[PDB]
Design a protein around this ligand. Structure first.
Ligand SMILES: Nc1ncnc2c1ncn2[C@@H]1O[C@H](COP(=O)(O)OP(=O)(O)OP(O)(O)=S)[C@@H](O)[C@H]1O
Ligand SMILES: Nc1ncnc2c1ncn2[C@@H]1O[C@H](COP(=O)(O)OP(=O)(O)OP(O)(O)=S)[C@@H](O)[C@H]1O
Ligand SMILES: Nc1ncnc2c1ncn2[C@@H]1O[C@H](COP(=O)(O)OP(=O)(O)OP(O)(O)=S)[C@@H](O)[C@H]1O
Lengths: 28, 48, 431, 437, 57, 431
């Protein structure tokens, strides 16, 4: 149950922007 | 750490996060996993 | 029961703009009563914002203090809903040691234009079953597994280096970007979670196709793109705010690239609303900039509120109607708010008491309405909660006129405090 | 699709070939004298001969000064740099006002760099050395040529290179079947990747399999890029420096705007002159539009004195609606347009006039057409009367709220009742000022 | 000389693999029974066929 | 091409004879006889470079030609002597103090001429052999007179390999550093290979000895030495202007070492001219610094121009003659420019016409000189180009009086614009 709760926490947090967004918003 | 939003920028994307939320090991299956024995049934290479 | 970060604020009871589909304001709807003409005007401006056709249209909300300008602005924001940028700032927020007032206004504008960018990625996800000896120029095999498929991949040198650098191990779920050959480890296998536990996270095996096309729509603002492009690690400025006067050339390039994407169907531009409360706090330089920042094709709808009379413009000796230069006043439409009658004040107090969850007797409502008409609306709103607390300390369920009188004597309004001061003014410092 | 700005109807100056302004043409109505002066200024700019010439557009607000400047921009086209700027822009926290002004000056001077690249592209069919008993004596294994067979979709060509190209052939991981680019001049081999024909669906490495080059082996033709002198100044002031300590340290520090020295700008001038002499570059000087020039302070005008007298300066258009105003940066010095008399001495003043009711009606109809608004003649007359009472901008702005009200009412036209209701909902500056008093 | 000019070694264009079940272009290869395949249905059919083959042999 | 026809493009010099007497019209310079003669005397004083920290002020009414005198002085001074021209507003930086900016301007105007004896070998490469497993090599170079075979050390081999020298290259090699500079491809070997290559343009074979010693002169400014010696990679601040407050002790060290170089035959000091145009934009602090910056032996000649008369000194409430404090005015000599007569105006207009390549009739000259006397010289000078464009639109070749009147009607001067404004004074803002 401790493993489940901590893994729930770590698997539930979304990044504010994320690598894909920062990459697609770059100018060439 | 759960309030560390800046660190998560280096780590994942939002599609990855949604994936993770949908795919996080459910609690029931965790006890199923920790009960069952190892399913080591690898058919081994064949080269057919 | 549980307290959130959001709790009972001044405008928390304004759930929207209470007007019909004909834009006719109901007397009391969505937590907003009275101000019929201004609410109708706000509905027209809201429809303008929703259509998103006309660029840089400026609206000014004018009226006496306590007449609902910020209430109307918050109602507009609540009717607009999320996913349409509504940027709310005070005129004071543009005076920064980081950047010029012009730059701050530019950032506020770029923050009210939203961009929805979509892309196709074509990734591979699966649980890795095997990575075998690469010793020869190195060559290896990777076995990936879904609940429905497993396939074996022949690895080139770059992919081998990426896999060995991430220490990808048998029994973990990765996603591989085919275009970039990028390995992202997102979790460990479902055959354990079986004695482990660390920074690691546990994920169950992907189901379906190993290779998947995927459409992801990214919501950003023009300001976010500007600060991402400002420097190599400029996305950190979205957090610290250490943006520092983004270059104009970068902004022109971003505007052109966004126009390209919109033509290509890649990007969708959602124009929004910039709300500057207390716009009388702007300089004449800031108003001069607003004159021209509105004439851009990428300008949002500007809403500004000011309770000033005929005041001198900041930074100048010139008297202008709303503290705003007359050249900018010609560029906007002015919404004026009529003061509140006894019925309107009573209705507002009733809605506020509903928000507070406080029950008040009808005599108490009459007395508090008269107090608000005498003193001010906000003072009555505050007396609401003060009398609720005094009633609770008395172990009563309903707030009586006695409690309102008690809190009235405990807490003064501006006029009575000014009087008590005035009779003692030699005791107060500097007049 | 496209969003309608306040100047989206202004498509040109509306002049006939003789240089005379039509009553209404290309989105502009009236103001004929100013449009004719602006045509003369457009010809001055197109002559590309005069540097640092300034025109001030002076008149009451709403008389088309910015409309005329943007019409000038449209007349010059996208190839001529048009740098719009507000007088408030000079007050930067990072750089001095003089630096902002000079940078904006360098943004109005355009440069068309035409560089012709000659490359040999294709898939490497063969890498064979040509052996000879050539040397100036010697019992060794000698080669006098390296045969490279390059295969494009169009055909195959066998190139014979300097034997020294063998070093870069294996410095780059160049084998048969790899896609390569051999600079005709530089002679540097460059492995783009491997041909995508040798690419199974079971291969995970990516950014290695490039499609077979299309067309001929021998082609890269001319790349033409347009820059401003400010772009060169900025590029050469702080190098990208992404390779070493510069990379990490500079990126880690915030990239502030710096006060570029006249030494750098002089060097850029020399380099651009040499580029033009070699025929690689073309100079297209543009126009700098300083709107709200009265927002500049005395120091800015004093600098403009020197900036306008340089041979490298663009054409400057100043707009000012100020009647007789204290110059910013001075306490009690009033000059006509908020501009010092000595700056007005080196300016040519184009004066814009108040519009008659008929001109306002024409402008309102043009704006309605631009915004996709059908307006009845009665509504147009009433809106013109409103504009006569209040102002042109106010009447122009009632169009879209009134069209929305008509749409809500089931109509597709603006009728008198809708404009009356919008007039009652929204106030102009005069009525609001009456209410305030 | 050979170290610097290995040369030769023709590239040998690969085989355009096909899925036995759907006769579609192959985009997967089963680690057991390296038969290529294109769909998940093809994968389960291939694995059933391998089970029957190993039962027969 | 990047130099177009500026306001002072016609000014080729001061137009003075050997007696420093001004010729009426010479070197694009009409009239201003006494002012031009004074400028010539100052120019001689600058050429001599004997007396340090000399200040001259050019004072006159607007349009009388102070900046033209300064530009003529710059042209007659030549590219070799430093001539830094700034506006008084340029010393107000956010990077540095006004005193620092003025010190930097002063040290840009002093030039250091550093002569060093190099030993180069310059020849045509007729053979180069490099053996590589330490590397061995041999190189044969020839002038028209001699040929020599060089056995190469490892460092020289590396230099040649980096610079990719072949037979037929004309190269120069520095004996101290081994730097390879290739001047082109030679007459004899010339064409090069029968491979891809490109086109060809060939240079001559050098004459004389391979080793020719030779003495080269390198010119820098004191500001460059300060910037390079201040920041360990401060050299890039010579372009970005990112040198904040160079230390006084660093400058003292630079001065001492430059004097030492001068005594030891290495350096020769070239005192230049600092031209502060619109010096009335300096504040009292800047003038006070200028007072003592002129007392140093490393101080240039200072030329200042101002059209003010009896004006406030910036940063103070005091009235002084030129907006310059009287203590600084006692430190300088004043060159007064007199207003222009009818014939001087006509001559200047003719010179500007010639510079812009416009033919115009004599009636046009009469009308335009009348306009210039009535309005201003600069307005007429702009009417020059305007009328030429009008004539070309008309498809004429000579600018007539009708074109001049047309451009007079199209473009206003300050007087007529001010009058038309006065008529509609209420329509303009903040009168
Ligand atoms: N229908 C309503 N109209 C206006 N104010 C309302 C209304 N209902 C409740 N209120 C409250 O009345 C108070 C008046 O504040 P607002 O006027 O909305 O904000 P404001 O920024 O102070 O604008 P002012 O006072 O007119 S300058 C706020 O506490 C509102 O929440
Ligand atoms: N002659 C004209 N013909 C057509 N449209 C015009 C004309 N003059 C102005 N307009 C338009 O009417 C509106 C008011 O003119 P503006 O150009 O915005 O005012 P303005 O004079 O440029 O502002 P200032 O005070 O000079 S900075 C804008 O939408 C213009 O595009
Ligand atoms: N010999 C001369 N002396 C002075 N001015 C001249 C002379 N010859 C031509 N000019 C004119 O000087 C103009 C330069 O601008 P002006 O303001 O008239 O003079 P200036 O050199 O700029 O000095 P100020 O500061 O403006 S009084 C040129 O456009 C010429 O027409």
């Amino acid at each position: 149950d401790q493993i489940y709760l901590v893994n729930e926490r770590r698997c539930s947090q979304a990044p504010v922007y994320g690598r894909d967004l920062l990459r697609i918003c770059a100018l060439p | 750490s759960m309030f560390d939003l800046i660190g998560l920028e280096n780590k994942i994307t939002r599609h990855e996060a949604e994936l993770l939320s949908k795919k996080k090991i459910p609690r029931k299956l965790m006890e199923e996993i920790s009960t069952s024995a190892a399913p080591a049934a690898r058919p081994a290479a064949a080269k057919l | 029961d549980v307290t959130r970060i959001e709790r009972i604020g001044a405008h928390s009871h304004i759930r929207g703009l209470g007007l019909d589909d004909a834009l006719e304001p109901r007397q009391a709807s969505q937590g907003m009563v009275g101000q019929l003409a201004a609410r109708r005007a706000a509905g027209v401006v809201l429809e303008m914002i929703r259509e998103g056709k006309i660029a840089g249209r400026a609206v000014l909300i004018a009226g006496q203090p306590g007449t609902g300008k910020t209430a109307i602005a918050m109602g507009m924001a609540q009717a607009l809903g999320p996913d349409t940028p509504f940027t709310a700032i005070a005129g004071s927020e543009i005076f920064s040691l980081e950047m010029s007032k012009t730059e701050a206004l530019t950032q506020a504008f770029r923050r009210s234009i939203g961009v929805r960018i979509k892309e196709e990625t074509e990734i591979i996800e699966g649980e890795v079953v095997e990575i075998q000896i690469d010793r020869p120029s190195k060559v290896g095999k990777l076995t990936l597994k879904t609940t429905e498929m497993e396939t074996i991949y022949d690895l080139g040198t770059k992919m081998i280096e990426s896999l060995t650098k991430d220490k990808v191990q048998a029994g973990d779920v990765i996603t591989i970007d085919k275009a970039t050959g990028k390995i992202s480890k997102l979790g460990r296998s479902f055959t354990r979670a079986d004695a482990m536990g660390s920074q690691t996270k546990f994920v169950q095996c992907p189901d379906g196709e190993l290779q998947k096309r995927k459409e992801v729509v990214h919501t950003v603002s023009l300001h976010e793109i500007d600060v991402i492009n400002s420097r190599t690690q400029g996305f950190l400025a979205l957090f610290s705010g250490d943006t520092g006067e983004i270059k104009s050339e970068v902004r022109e390039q971003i505007n052109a690239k966004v126009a390209e994407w919109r033509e290509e169907g890649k990007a969708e531009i959602i124009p929004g609303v910039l709300f500057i409360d207390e716009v009388h706090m702007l300089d004449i330089e800031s108003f001069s900039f607003l004159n021209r920042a509105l004439e851009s094709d990428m300008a949002p709808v500007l809403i500004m509120a000011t309770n000033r009379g005929i005041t001198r413009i900041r930074g100048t000796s010139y008297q202008s109607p709303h503290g705003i230069p007359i050249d900018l006043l010609d560029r906007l439409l002015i919404v004026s708010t009529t003061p509140y009658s006894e019925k309107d004040t009573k209705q507002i107090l009733r809605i506020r008491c509903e928000e507070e969850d406080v029950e008040m007797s009808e005599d108490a409502y009459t007395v508090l309405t008269r107090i608000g008409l005498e003193t001010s609306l906000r003072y009555a709103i505050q007396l609401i909660t003060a009398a609720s607390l005094v009633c609770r300390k008395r172990k009563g369920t309903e707030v009586q006129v006695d409690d309102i009188k008690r809190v009235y004597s405990l807490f003064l309004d501006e006029s009575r405090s000014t009087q008590y001061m005035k009779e003692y003014q030699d005791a107060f410092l500097f007049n | 699709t496209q969003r309608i700005a306040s100047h989206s109807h202004v498509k040109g100056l509306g002049l006939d070939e003789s240089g005379l302004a039509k009553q209404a043409a290309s989105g502009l109505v009236g103001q004929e004298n100013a449009r004719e002066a602006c045509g003369v200024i457009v010809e001055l700019i197109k002559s590309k001969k005069m540097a640092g010439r300034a025109v001030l557009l002076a008149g009451p607000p709403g008389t088309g000064k910015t409309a005329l400047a943007l019409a000038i921009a449209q007349e010059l086209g996208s190839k001529v740099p048009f740098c719009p700027m507000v007088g408030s822009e000079v007050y930067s926290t990072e750089i001095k006002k003089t630096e902002v002004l000079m940078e904006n000056f360098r943004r109005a001077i355009g440069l068309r760099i035409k560089e012709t690249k000659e490359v040999y592209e294709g898939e490497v069919t063969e890498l064979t050395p040509c052996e000879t008993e050539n040397p100036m004596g010697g019992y060794g294994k000698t080669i006098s040529h390296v045969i490279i067979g390059l295969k494009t979709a169009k055909g195959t060509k066998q190139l014979k290179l300097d034997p020294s190209i063998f070093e870069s052939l294996q410095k780059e991981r160049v084998e048969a079947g790899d896609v390569i680019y051999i600079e005709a001049n530089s002679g540097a081999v460059k492995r783009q990747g491997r041909c995508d024909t040798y690419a199974t669906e079971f291969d995970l490495e990516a950014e290695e399999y490039v499609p077979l080059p299309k067309g001929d082996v021998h082609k890269k033709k001319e790349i033409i890029q347009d820059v401003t002198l400010h772009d060169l100044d900025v590029a050469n002031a702080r190098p990208q420096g992404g390779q070493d300590i510069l990379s990490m340290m500079g990126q880690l520090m915030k990239p502030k705007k710096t006060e570029i020295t006249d030494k750098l700008r002089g060097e850029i001038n020399k380099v651009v002159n040499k580029y033009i002499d070699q025929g690689i570059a073309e100079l297209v000087p543009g126009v700098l539009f300083v709107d709200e020039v009265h927002m500049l302070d005395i120091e800015c005008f004093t600098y403009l004195h020197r900036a306008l007298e340089s041979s490298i300066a663009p054409i400057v258009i100043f707009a000012s609606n100020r009647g007789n105003c204290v110059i910013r940066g001075t306490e009690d010095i009033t000059s006509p347009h908020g501009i010092p008399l000595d700056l007005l001495d080196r300016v040519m003043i184009i004066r814009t006039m108040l519009y008659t009711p008929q001109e306002m009606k024409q402008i309102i109809k043009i704006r309605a057409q631009t915004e996709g608004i059908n307006i009845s003649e009665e509504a147009l007359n009433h809106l013109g009367e409103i504009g006569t009472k209040t102002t042109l901008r106010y009447s122009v702005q009632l169009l879209t709220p009134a069209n929305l009200l008509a749409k809500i009412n089931g109509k597709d036209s603006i009728e008198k009742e809708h404009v009356e209701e919008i007039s009652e909902l929204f106030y102009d500056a005069k009525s609001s000022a009456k209410i305030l008093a | 000389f050979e170290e610097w000019f290995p040369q030769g070694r023709p590239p040998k264009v690969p085989v355009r693999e096909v899925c036995p079940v759907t006769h579609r272009p192959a985009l997967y290869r089963d680690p057991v029974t390296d038969i290529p395949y294109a769909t998940a249905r093809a994968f389960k059919i291939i694995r059933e066929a391998y089970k029957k083959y190993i039962t027969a042999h």
